[PDB]
Amino acid sequence: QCYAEITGWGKCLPPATLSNHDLSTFLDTSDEWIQSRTGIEQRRISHVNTSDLATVAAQHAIACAGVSVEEIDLIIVATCSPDSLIPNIASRVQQNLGIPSAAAFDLNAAATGFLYGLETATRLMQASHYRHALVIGAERLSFYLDWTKRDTAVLFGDGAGAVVLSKTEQKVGLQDAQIGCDAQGRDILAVPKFGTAMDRFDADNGYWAFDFVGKEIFKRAVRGMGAAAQQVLARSGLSTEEIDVVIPHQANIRIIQTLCDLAGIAQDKAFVNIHRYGNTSAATVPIALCEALEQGKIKPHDDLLVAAFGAGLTWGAGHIRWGERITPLGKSDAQLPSCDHTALDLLSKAIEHCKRH
Amino acid sequence: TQCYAEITGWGKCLPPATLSNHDLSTFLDTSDEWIQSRTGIEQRRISHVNTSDLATVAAQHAIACAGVSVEEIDLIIVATCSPDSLIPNIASRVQQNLGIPSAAAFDLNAAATGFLYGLETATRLMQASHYRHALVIGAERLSFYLDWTKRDTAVLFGDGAGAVVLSKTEQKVGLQDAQIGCDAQGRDILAVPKFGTAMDRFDADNGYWAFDFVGKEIFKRAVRGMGAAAQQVLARSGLSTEEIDVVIPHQANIRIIQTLCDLAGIAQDKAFVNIHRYGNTSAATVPIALCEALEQGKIKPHDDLLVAAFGAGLTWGAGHIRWGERITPLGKSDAQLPSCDHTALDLLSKAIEHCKRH
Ligand SMILES: CC(C)(COP(=O)(O)OP(=O)(O)OC[C@H]1O[C@@H](n2cnc3c(N)ncnc32)[C@H](O)[C@@H]1OP(=O)(O)O)[C@@H](O)C(=O)NCCC(=O)NCCS
Ligand SMILES: CCCCCCCC(=O)O
Fold this sequence. Notes:
2 copies of one chain form a homodimer. By secondary structure, chain A is of the alpha/beta class. Chain A has 11 helices and 13 strands. The first copy, chain A, has helices at residues 20-24, 31-37, 50-65, 89-97, 113-127, 150-153, 214-236, 253-263, 274-277, 284-294, 343-356, and strands at residues 3-12, 17-19, 42-44, 74-78, 103-108, 132-140, 158-168, 173-181, 189-190, 211-212, 245-248, 303-310, 314-321. Chain B: It is an enzyme of class 2 (transferase). Chain B: The active site is at 112, 250, 280.
């Protein structure tokens, strides 16, 4: 019996920041409404592709773990916004990092993708011959947004988070997990016409709908994450009070609060950074984990509950038992190339096109 | 304690519209003579429906074949590089279509090696955790991507889907050892760089994307990648090469398949080939081939199978499957695609005209 210890953690947030005030200059919205309803103050807009965000996050996690790129056997990138479909962006991260041989694939389960990835990498390592793995959640959601619709335009940001996993006999890392999907919620969070269903030669194919029914997402997410968390906790044999930290998906603060309240988990145990970055889909959990560790929220031997949901409607929860070390072995100098533009400047073309159309 | 994931169901979905080599000759400077001689491809299928619809039908056939209830399916993996949509994933669409409650549902992209990646992943998930039954699907609508003015690539690819159902068991069956990987130095020799979030969303000409393709370099890297993976798998199995009963390869090029077998010392007649009927269907190739090998009586109970594949990445893989007792379906499915009211040329008419005009 082995386990997959989380030995490295890292993040990459692009520098360009879009404030609620910035959004109010081109949409009929306010910082007052957004902060009160969502809890989001700011979000980051990438000047580079998803794979570049993923690469920097991975470099930080590798340094943190002190592992050699020659030791990495498996690379999973969880994303719904890959640079390209052919080939996958896991292979681009592999190419960028100079990792020889590793299995490299992209996984799409929306914002639950990082937990899906962590479950998958963990079980691969437990049942087969993978010694070290790199699991990355990375998104450039700004690509997708309709800048005339305030409902969806204020919720999402770009970013990437990463972990490195190391095979061990110590009972650490992901213990039980339950992942799933409520396919009856499929049509309430969707971009139906980007992908091979779109008309390739229609000049207006860029003006797609972002389907979004917020109250239905709320209900299904709470139900989905809640029951998954219960299964995990029940299988662990832990009482609810033994959970030290909750690392949730960062989509909505009231969802996080409701999840904890219905579970009877203390509100102050949930790590929240949505105010800074908004919803970065698959990046939310690994960015949050990385920041929780940086800010001293996770102690050695802590019991963590991870929980997430996403378009699908995918859902999941996991129980992580932390090991001995909460400090990086090394630091990485890795950074994105310099950003010569403001967030409004980056979005200028897309805003003008959506408004004209 | 030690369990295994038996392949208990297999199924396929090939769309009805057939594009012949003659059809291709009416709008490209090519001939059936050249294509059949050079590639061995006679026909390929062009879908009138989205990838998820192909995936759904293949799954229905596999589920009937396995005699499993949709309530028993705990995991759905769709390997594809041509999904209907990115948000949400198409695994969830298959789940919605089939009425599967609760199952983990995700899309996996490792190009044509995706089915083997999927089979490895589902197997290990079942071995290390609480998944009793899984559905693993390779499904593609590659016709979406093609430049119909370029005969080089336009004659090689097709649409389709294949599926398996896996069932947890104590019997030493299903996927035994596997080795999967990626040669990222081959990343730039097979690619469609400008479809995805790297593309200009508001450029009216963003549909006319280029391909990176260096055929001799793909050949070399694919043979090297699959060959060494197959060796690792065989070496870990403790089997001699003569004990392999059937090879189920990726159907990209017949000389690649031949070279793989020759360098491994595997008899050429053990490799199952259906590229002549369907061309390269990326992640669907292996599961369609497996399904057809079973239908045609090529796989016996207790046979040792070698699966091998490669794809853009350059991803690569091999697997050793030990077959169990049953090679016949428990049930048949009536599931079919909706009627196709168009010929393959009619389906491709708009895309052909646009590519020619541009
Ligand atoms: C076995 C192998 C020789 C197969 O070759 P092939 O792709 O079937 O055919 P080739 O690319 O060698 O083409 C041979 C000639 O036919 C011509 N040709 C190509 N497509 C044609 C068409 N549709 N009609 C008529 N002639 C054509 C070419 O001009 C070429 O001549 P050239 O060498 O002077 O350019 C292999 O070594 C190879 O090169 N494969 C390339 C692709 C590959 O290996 N994998 C792709 C999977 S994604
Ligand atoms: C132009 C798109 C064709 C599909 C390329 C991937 C096929 C493979 O992996 O073998």
